Amino acid sequence: MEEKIIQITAGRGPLECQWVVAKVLKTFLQEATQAGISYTILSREEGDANLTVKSVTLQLKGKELASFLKTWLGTVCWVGKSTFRKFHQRSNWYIGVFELDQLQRQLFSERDVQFQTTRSQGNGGQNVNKVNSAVRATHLPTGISVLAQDSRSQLDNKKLALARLKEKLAEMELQQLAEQAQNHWNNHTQVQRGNPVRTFKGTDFKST
Amino acid sequence: MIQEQTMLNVADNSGARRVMCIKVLGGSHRRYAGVGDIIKITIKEAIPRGKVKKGDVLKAVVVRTKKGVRRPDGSVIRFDGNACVLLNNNSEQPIGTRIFGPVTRELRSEKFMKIISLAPEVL
Amino acid sequence: ATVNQLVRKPRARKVAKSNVPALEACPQKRGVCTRVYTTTPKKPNSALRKVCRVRLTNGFEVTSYIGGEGHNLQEHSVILIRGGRVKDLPGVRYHTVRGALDCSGVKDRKQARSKYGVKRPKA
RNA sequence: UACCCGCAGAAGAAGCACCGGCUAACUCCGUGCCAGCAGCCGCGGUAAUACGGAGGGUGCAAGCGUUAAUCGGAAUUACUG
RNA sequence: GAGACACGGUCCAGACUCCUACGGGAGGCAGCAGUGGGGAAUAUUGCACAAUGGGCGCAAGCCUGAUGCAGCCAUGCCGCG
Ligand SMILES: [Mg+2]
Ligand SMILES: [Mg+2]
Ligand SMILES: [Mg+2]
Ligand SMILES: [Mg+2]
Ligand SMILES: [Mg+2]
Ligand SMILES: [Mg+2]
Ligand SMILES: [Mg+2]
Ligand SMILES: [Mg+2]
Ligand SMILES: [Mg+2]
Ligand SMILES: [Mg+2]
Ligand SMILES: [Mg+2]
Ligand SMILES: [Mg+2]
Ligand SMILES: [Mg+2]
Ligand SMILES: [Mg+2]
Ligand SMILES: [Mg+2]
Ligand SMILES: [Mg+2]
Ligand SMILES: [Mg+2]
Ligand SMILES: [Mg+2]
Ligand SMILES: [Mg+2]
Ligand SMILES: [Mg+2]
Ligand SMILES: [Mg+2]
Ligand SMILES: [Mg+2]
Ligand SMILES: [Mg+2]
Ligand SMILES: [Mg+2]
């Protein structure tokens, strides 16, 4: 059972390209359900007019996926006159299909946390020069450390350090999705207008 | 008598001119390294186009010392400076292809026969 | 314009440079096929155009154009460039010779074969 | 040995480029702003002499296109001007 | 010696390539061929000094690998196919 994430995008094209994207997405879903694979919709950001979608993301779950995909991956071309401008001459409209990447999202283990007890660096008083309530939770793979000394109860300091480590790793887990969406974005301008793997002619929408 | 921070000259053509010793190998709390001992060095200044570049950490073998080497008959051979030959950090074989200056027969062994053969004169 | 002015400073000749400077006094300058792609022409034309990136021996870099129909070139390869400029492919000053240190001829061309490097189709 | 004298047979040797205009020379079949691009102006988005093949013409040929490269046309460093 | 401070003459220093018992020694194709390399690209480790005349000698003789020249190549050009 393989997992594939694919993106269908209009590139940097007009409303005709958006309409072609919608039609190709519908045909792709119909063919996938015929082939027996399941799916879910992730993003369906709309275009600018009615029945015009800009880009869509698909989650593919099934078996023998690398054979179903290799007849779709690439550039899909629709040969037909523009329906929004009745006298435009351009006849070929190209849309792109790409294969995306996913991370290894794992729940936070607590067994990866190391605790150090040391002296709270104040100015300071002679009791805080003793107190080893400064708790340092260090995450051994990532090396990220956070210190908690808010309370003079060391159990609460340990709990606060663990909670802060949770929070701060939940900002290293959150700057990876943005970093990979910066990579998803490039696919929009990476569409190449030529060498079509599939061709649909007219409104009859015959495959070729 | 070669310690850490000791500055040695270079007796081959690997490209380096001055090195500085950063470790004496082969024991705990070792103080000194004599003729025939391996040391860990760093390159301090070199020629513009050579096999090694400044700041690299690498191995070496001691060849010439001012302190000298004793012989069974009680004699001693001194020199006017400290020199070493650069070796590979992994295989411990000389990097260059030519040896300058004399050497001694404390290097006569299965490990430094290439150095002995390349040396122009052996004391 | 007067004779006194022209003897105090004579007529200055106009200096002209070439539009294929990377050839460096040579009809060809050797380079490696670093990376191969297709680009799209600007107004008013529209197609896909086949090119290749090339690295010069002196440390520079150029871009070449693949003519004919069908090209079998990949990266990690070394070609040459003959000359000739394509405008609406902004930044392309050279044409690949059909068979220059990596390339082959146009498949099943039948006339004007000398320019596209097709060997003689002989009955 | 240059060269001089006999043998056989068209044999053992005809190919190459461009082609809308500049510039001598454009019809068709395939395709459809795709495949194809030059020296410039510019062709191809269903009717193409500008693309490919066929074909055709024209002109050359032990050579054509590209530079390294020059001069000219350029009176576009102009004393002649 | 007349002659530069010197191609194949001398001495010293230097880098590179070789022979050695380790003490020490030898060498310079930008002469004709040739090899490796570089290139986008250019010939065969051929012969007769028979001639030239440099050269050296009275000369024979010979360096001669410049010369006479070869073999090869569409390289520039010329005339041939
Ligand atoms: Mg109307
Ligand atoms: Mg105070
Ligand atoms: Mg206290
Ligand atoms: Mg042509
Ligand atoms: Mg024309
Ligand atoms: Mg004409
Ligand atoms: Mg064309
Ligand atoms: Mg049209
Ligand atoms: Mg047509
Ligand atoms: Mg001729
Ligand atoms: Mg001129
Ligand atoms: Mg003039
Ligand atoms: Mg004399
Ligand atoms: Mg002289
Ligand atoms: Mg001399
Ligand atoms: Mg000598
Ligand atoms: Mg010589
Ligand atoms: Mg020789
Ligand atoms: Mg030579
Ligand atoms: Mg060579
Ligand atoms: Mg070569
Ligand atoms: Mg040969
Ligand atoms: Mg002679
Ligand atoms: Mg010729």
Swiss-Prot record, chain B:
UniProt effect for mutating R98A: Reduced RsfS binding
GO cellular component: cytoplasm; cytosol; cytosolic large ribosomal subunit
Keywords: Ribonucleoprotein, Ribosomal protein, RNA-binding, rRNA-binding
Domain of life where this protein originates: Bacteria
CDD domains reported in the protein's UniProt record: Ribosomal_uL14
InterPro entries: Ribosomal_uL14, Ribosomal_uL14_bac-type, Ribosomal_uL14_CS, Ribosomal_uL14_sf
GO biological process terms held by the UniProt record: cytoplasmic translation
A molecular function (GO) term: large ribosomal subunit rRNA binding
Listed result of changing K114A: Reduced RsfS binding
Main function: Binds to 23S rRNA. Forms part of two intersubunit bridges in the 70S ribosome.
Family statement drawn from the similarity comment of this UniProt entry: Belongs to the universal ribosomal protein uL14 family.
Subunit structure: Part of the 50S ribosomal subunit. Forms a cluster with proteins L3 and L19. Forms two bridges to the 30S subunit in the 70S ribosome, contacting the 16S rRNA. In pre-50S ribosomal subunits interacts with RsfS, which may inhibit association with the 30S subunit.
Identification of the protein by name: Large ribosomal subunit protein uL14
Source organism of the structure: Escherichia coli (strain K12)
Record gene name: rplN
